[PDB]
Amino acid sequence: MKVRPSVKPICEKCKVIRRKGKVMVICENPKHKQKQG
Amino acid sequence: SRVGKKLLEIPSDVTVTLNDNNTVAVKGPKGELTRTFHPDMEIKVEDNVLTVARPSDQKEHRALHGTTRSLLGNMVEGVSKGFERGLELVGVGYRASKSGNKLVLNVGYSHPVEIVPEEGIEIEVPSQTKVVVKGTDKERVGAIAANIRAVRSPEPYKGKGIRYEGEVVRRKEGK
Amino acid sequence: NYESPTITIPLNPNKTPSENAQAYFTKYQKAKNSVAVVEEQIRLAQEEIEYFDQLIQQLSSASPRDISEIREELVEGKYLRPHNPVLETYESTSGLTILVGKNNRQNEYLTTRVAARDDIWLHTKDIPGSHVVIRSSEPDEQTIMEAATIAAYFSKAKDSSSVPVDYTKIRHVKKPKPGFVTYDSQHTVFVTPDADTVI
Amino acid sequence: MLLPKRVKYRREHRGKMRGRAKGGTEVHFGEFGIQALEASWITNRQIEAARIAMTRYMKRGGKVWIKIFPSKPYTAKPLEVRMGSGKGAPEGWVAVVKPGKVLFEISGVSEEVAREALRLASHKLPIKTKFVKRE
Amino acid sequence: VKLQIPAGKANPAPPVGPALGQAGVNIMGFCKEFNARTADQAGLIIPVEISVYEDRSFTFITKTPPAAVLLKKAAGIESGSGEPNRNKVATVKRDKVREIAETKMPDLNAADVEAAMRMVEGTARSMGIVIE
Amino acid sequence: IETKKVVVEEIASKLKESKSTIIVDYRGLNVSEVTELRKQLREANVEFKVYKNTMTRRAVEQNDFLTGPNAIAFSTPAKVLNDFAKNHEALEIKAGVIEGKVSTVEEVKALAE
RNA sequence: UAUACGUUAAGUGGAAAAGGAUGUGGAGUUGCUUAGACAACCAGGAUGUUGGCUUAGAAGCAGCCACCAUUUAAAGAGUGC
Numbered sequence: 017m018k019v020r021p022s023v024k025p026i027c028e029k030c031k032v033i034r035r036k037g038k039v040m041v042i043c044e045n046p047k048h049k050q051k052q053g
Numbered sequence: 054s055r056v057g058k059k060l061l062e063i064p065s066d067v068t069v070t071l072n073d074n075n076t077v078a079v080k081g082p083k084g085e086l087t088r089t090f091h092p093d094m095e096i097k098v099e100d101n102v103l104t105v106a107r108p109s110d111q112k113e114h115r116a117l118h119g120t121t122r123s124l125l126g127n128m129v130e131g132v133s134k135g136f137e138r139g140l141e142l143v144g145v146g147y148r149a150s151k152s153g154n155k156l157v158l159n160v161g162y163s164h165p166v167e168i169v170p171e172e173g174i175e176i177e178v179p180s181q182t183k184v185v186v187k188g189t190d191k192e193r194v195g196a197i198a199a200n201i202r203a204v205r206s207p208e209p210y211k212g213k214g215i216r217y218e219g220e221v222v223r224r225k226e227g228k
Numbered sequence: 229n230y231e232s233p234t235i236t237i238p239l240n241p242n243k244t245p246s247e248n249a250q251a252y253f254t255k256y257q258k259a260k261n262s263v264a265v266v267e268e269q270i271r272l273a274q275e276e277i278e279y280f281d282q283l284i285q286q287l288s289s290a291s292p293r294d295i296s297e298i299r300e301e302l303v304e305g306k307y308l309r310p311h312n313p314v315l316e317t318y319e320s321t322s323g324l325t326i327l328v329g330k331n332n333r334q335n336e337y338l339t340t341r342v343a344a345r346d347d348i349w350l351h352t353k354d355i356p357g358s359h360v361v362i363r364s365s366e367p368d369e370q371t372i373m374e375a376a377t378i379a380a381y382f383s384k385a386k387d388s389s390s391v392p393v394d395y396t397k398i399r400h401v402k403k404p405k406p407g408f409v410t411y412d413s414q415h416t417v418f419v420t421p422d423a424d425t426v427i
Numbered sequence: 428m429l430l431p432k433r434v435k436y437r438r439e440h441r442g443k444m445r446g447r448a449k450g451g452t453e454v455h456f457g458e459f460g461i462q463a464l465e466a467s468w469i470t471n472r473q474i475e476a477a478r479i480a481m482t483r484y485m486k487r488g489g490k491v492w493i494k495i496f497p498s499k500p501y502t503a504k505p506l507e508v509r510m511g512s513g514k515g516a517p518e519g520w521v522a523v524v525k526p527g528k529v530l531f532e533i534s535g536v537s538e539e540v541a542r543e544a545l546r547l548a549s550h551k552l553p554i555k556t557k558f559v560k561r562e
Numbered sequence: 563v564k565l566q567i568p569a570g571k572a573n574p575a576p577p578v579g580p581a582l583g584q585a586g587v588n589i590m591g592f593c594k595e596f597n598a599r600t601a602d603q604a605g606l607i608i609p610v611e612i613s614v615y616e617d618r619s620f621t622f623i624t625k626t627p628p629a630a631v632l633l634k635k636a637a638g639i640e641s642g643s644g645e646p647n648r649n650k651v652a653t654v655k656r657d658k659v660r661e662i663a664e665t666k667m668p669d670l671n672a673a674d675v676e677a678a679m680r681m682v683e684g685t686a687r688s689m690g691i692v693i694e
Numbered sequence: 695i696e697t698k699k700v701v702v703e704e705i706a707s708k709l710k711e712s713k714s715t716i717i718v719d720y721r722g723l724n725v726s727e728v729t730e731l732r733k734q735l736r737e738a739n740v741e742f743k744v745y746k747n748t749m750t751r752r753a754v755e756q757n758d759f760l761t762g763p764n765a766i767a768f769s770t771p772a773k774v775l776n777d778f779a780k781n782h783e784a785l786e787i788k789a790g791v792i793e794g795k796v797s798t799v800e801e802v803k804a805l806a807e
Numbered sequence: 808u809a810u811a812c813g814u815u816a817a818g819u820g821g822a823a824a825a826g827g828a829u830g831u832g833g834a835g836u837u838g839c840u841u842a843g844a845c846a847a848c849c850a851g852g853a854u855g856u857u858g859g860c861u862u863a864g865a866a867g868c869a870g871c872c873a874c875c876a877u878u879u880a881a882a883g884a885g886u887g888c
Contacts, residue, residue: 022826032829037817039828044223052827054845230575230589253863553825564857564866576863630859642859645872671854672877673736681855684876688858688884695840702842720880725853729878736878744880748842763850765880784850 018050025050057118062102064133069098079124083135083189084173088125091117103129128190137187138198139218143207147214148181156184160205161214168201282407286331288384289358294331301332304406314341320362321374321425328378329359332407339363340403349401349411350375350393357383367395372417374425381421389420429471429497430520437517438502448528453559456492457532459541460559466524467554471497474522477531477548484544489535497522529559563612570604572597585614592620600624607631626666629685633658637691646690654686655694705745709753713793714769716802719762719786720744731778740771754796759788772806 023039025032030043040051063069068080077096078087090096094117095106105121107114123132142148142160150157156176158166170176174188174197186194198217207214209225216222240248283298290298293313302308314337317327327342329335339349339361348367351359360375367375372395380391393416400413444466454460474493482488497520504515524530531548533541542558549556563581567574572593579589600608612622634640637652644651659679663670670678686693720728735742744765751760767775769792779785790802797805 020827024827034828034830037830039830054847230573230579250863256863550826555825566857629855641861643872644860646859646875647873649872666855669855673733677877678855679876681876684884685855685858687875688856688873690859690873695842698842721850723851725851725878725882727853728851729853732878746842746880752842763880 017046019053020050021052023050023052055119057105057115057121059121060102060104061122061129062133063098063100067132069103071096071098077125079132081124081132083124083132086124086128086132086189088128090126094118127192131189131191134191135189136191136194137185138194139183139185140198140201140215141182141184141218142205142215143212144182144214147205149178149184150181151176151178158204166204168197170197279407283332285352285356286335286358288356289382290331294334297331297333314338318378318426320371320378321422322370324362324365324371324374326375326378326426327361327363329361331358335359335409339398339401343398345401346397346399348372348375348395349398350379350395350417351411352379352383352385353392353394353416355380355383355385355388355391357385361398373419376417376419377421378426379421380419381423382426386421390418391420392416392418428475428520429522431496431498434500437500438514439499441501442499442523444523444525446525448525451494451529452527454492454529454532454561457490458534458561459538460529460532460561461545461549461556462529462559463524463526464555464557465526466528468499468501469497469522469524471520471522473551474530477551480547480551481531481533481544484547485536485540488540488544489533492532492534494529494531495522499523524554530556563614565610565612566607567593567596567610568604568606569600569602569608570597570606582612582614582620585618585620587620596622596624626669629662629666629682630689632662632665633686633689633691643690646687650690650692652689652691653694654691659683659686659693702749705749706753709745709749710756712753712766712768712791714791716767716769716772716775716790716797716805717750717759717788718765718767718775719788720765721763722784723782727782731774734774734778735767735771738771738774740774741768742766743768762786764788772802776806 023041025041025043026048027043027045030041030045030048033040033042035051038052041049043049066080066082070078072078072087072089075090075092076088077090079085093108093114095108097104097106103121105118107118117126120127120130122130123134144160147160149159152167154170154176156168156170156178158168160166170186172188172190172193174186174193177185177187179185186197188194202215202217205214207216207220207222209223209227211227212222212224239245240251243251283301286294287298296310297313299308299310303310315327315330315334317325317338320326327338329338335358339359343349343361343363347364348362348371349359350361350367350372351357357379360379362371362375365371376391376393376395379393380386380389383391385391394411394414395417396411396414398411400411402408402410402412448463452462474495474497478491499521500517501519501521502515503518531545533545536544538560545558563578563585565578565581567577573590574593575589578593582592583589596608596610600610602608607627608624609626609628610622610624612620614620630642633652633654636654636658639652642651643649659682662682663675663678667675667678670681672678672681732742742765747760747762747764750764751757754760772787772790775785775787779787787799787802787806789799790797790805792805795801
């Protein structure tokens with residue numbers, strides 16, 4: 017997990033989604049895993 | 054290119070009862086199982102098949118039309134599947150048994166742990182690692198599967214802990 | 229050993245047969261790389277040793293203009309720090325003129341700049357000396373003997389007769405690296421000498 | 428650090444930013460430009476930061492045709508000082524903008540490389556802009 | 563398992579002693595079976611595929627040598643081109659292509675002679691050789 | 695889609711010119727078993743290829759068999775196919791034709807036996 | 808608690824940026840595309856060749872050149888594990 021405002025994926029298996037009105041990056045990788053808040 | 058566009062069936066031993074506008078019940082060999090719903094979706098049981106229409110070509114009515122298969126809602130994504138989840142642990146002394154229907158648990162702690170299959174589940178412990186939840190509700194079966202695996206979930210630094218038996222676990226290279 | 233000694237090795241418990249096998253290969257290639265590095269270093273070192281000996285080969289025949297010329301050669305070698313001054317020649321005893329390659333660079337100027345290909349060339353056969361050439365003069369018995377003679381008594385082995393200078397067409401005279409030239413495809417002529425004929 | 432080596436007056440009145448770019452609003456010395464949507468006062472350190480960014484993403488990247496030059500100076504008085512006592516002292520340089528103005532053309536390198544290079548260039552910057560190319 | 567061994571050699575443990583030591587065969591036993599069947603040149607190279615049934619009932623098919631080997635013997639190279647399409651360190655003939663066809667058209671893997679040659683020349687350019 | 699028209703055109707050319715052909719489902723067998731089959735049919739000189747079902751059906755009308763992934767073997771054979779089939783048994787022998795003699799499964803079997 | 812036509816859902820409205828974003832609705836452009844596309848699922852994903860070099864071994868996957876040709880529906884001298 018990584019907070020930032022400048023969220024965006026890294027790999028291609030990094031995947032863009034939304035959750036609870038908030039933007040997130042799924043990936044396989046926790047060290048790609050992200051979201052804003 | 055769609056989930057909901059299908060015409061979704063009434064195979065056998067099935068009995069709907071539209072108890073009101075949106076209150077509906079089902080019987081089948083899987084069991085008798087009932088719900089109540091939103092009014093916009095015009096849901097209509099035909100000979101051997103159910104059909105639904107949405108009043109408005111809208112984002113949520115799409116969700117519903119995609120949950121148009123079997124029992125009542127997402128359980129109108131469930132009946133004719135009919136459900137279970139196995140689980141095999143990954144351990145050394147990690148194991149379990151049952152207290153009747155209930156479940157006895159001997160894993161990683163100064164104490165053991167106890168669990169109950171309240172909702173007509175059958176737990177089956179064919180082996181000390183092999184256990185199976187079985188029922189007819191995706192919600193409930195997956196729910197307890199996760200409840201369990203959260204307790205002693207599996208590990209990165211070793212393959213330990215509970216496992217969704219079909220999982221592709223992250224093998225962090227056990228350091 | 230497919231040989232059959234049955235060595236009982238060290239194998240490092242808590243570390244796999246794989247791990248320790250490829251670690252054996254790791255130390256193998258490691259000692260291999262270390263020693264091969266050190267052996268090409270030492271190969272550079274041996275060619276450097278005979279490069280001193282070659283510098284000295286020319287130096288024992290060097291004159292003071294060659295002292296300055298080799299100071300330039302060692303700016304080139306990086307070893308020193310101080311304009312067309314190619315080389316010189318001498319009067320052969322056979323009433324000819326022999327170009328006297330008097331240094332590394334003077335040899336470049338007397339042979340690689342001045343002399344002609346397929347000419348008669350000569351260098352001191354393992355004696356500390358300079359080279360010479362009967363450039364565009366196919367050194368006959370007399371001329372080749374006199375040139376090999378001037379070399380045979382101009383070397384630091386001037387006491388040793390039978391200086392066996394390999395002569396032939398300069399077409400085969402090799403050149404390289406840098407300062408790595410040779411005179412090959414060549415028949416040896418053993419010579420002795422007097423001195424004052426050169427002038 | 429872009430400079431004018433020589434100047435008439437070390438100092439100026441400050442200036443304003445109204446309206447739009449007179450000229451140089453389109454790539455024609457190069458191929459693939461970037462242009463303004465705003466305007467501000469800009470430093471040679473910033474533009475050369477973009478330079479090194481794009482030319483490392485590209486590693487020699489093509490050719491540019493920079494459109495600008497930091498003609499304007501600006502002053503900066505010393506610190507914890509009161510008003511007056513004459514205008515402050517010249518500090519650095521300034522490069523001014525109008526919206527619609529092109530800043531950097533590019534040529535000799537692929538359009539996609541151009542896009543990403545100027546992405547990394549743009550994210551340096553205080554402004555809003557967009558990619559452009561020749562007619 | 564594919565092996566790649568000269569027709570006359572036997573008991574190179576390190577190649578197959580692993581490869582069929584988990585299978586557990588006589589190293590020299592099977593390698594001299596191989597030499598008895600391919601009683602031919604040592605220093606040569608035969609590709610040979612061994613098929614083992616679950617009960618350890620091993621059989622195998624020996625096959626024609628590599629064109630790499632034949633043309634190392636032809637041109638006289640040890641390594642192929644250090645950089646094919648930049649260095650060509652070896653040269654053969656169209657006649658050599660036909661010789662190798664007639665040698666190995668049993669093992670060749672395109673029904674036509676010309677498509678056989680297309681594949682053969684795919685390999686010739688793989689290893690970086692020119693034609694005479 | 696003029697390129698689609700060229701594709702359908704060329705396939706139509708061969709598909710009209712087809713005078714004897716046996717038609718089969720292909721599924722569940724690797725490229726190497728496939729290439730074994732190809733070796734034996736190549737030496738059989740019975741010309742095997744692979745084509746698509748929309749287009750095959752448009753020819754037949756020019757159908758219930760015709761769905762599913764279908765390959766063909768021209769003549770102008772099915773014994774080799776019996777061999778491969780009983781040897782391997784991941785196929786179907788749905789239909790065939792000889793000089794326009796559109797063939798049942800049992801009829802292609804008779805032609806194949 | 809006006810009328811008509813659309814908007815948003817954040818209480819934005821009713822406090823602000825860089826920047827982010829399959830948010831949204833609107834127009835508009837443009838290739839695939841019901842000879843059925845895309846996805847899912849099923850079938851395959853092969854041959855010389857483990858391409859050659861180097862490497863103890865480099866075998867699609869240490870690194871270097873090559874990156875060919877064939878069954879071909881198509882499978883790379885290999886996209887990643």
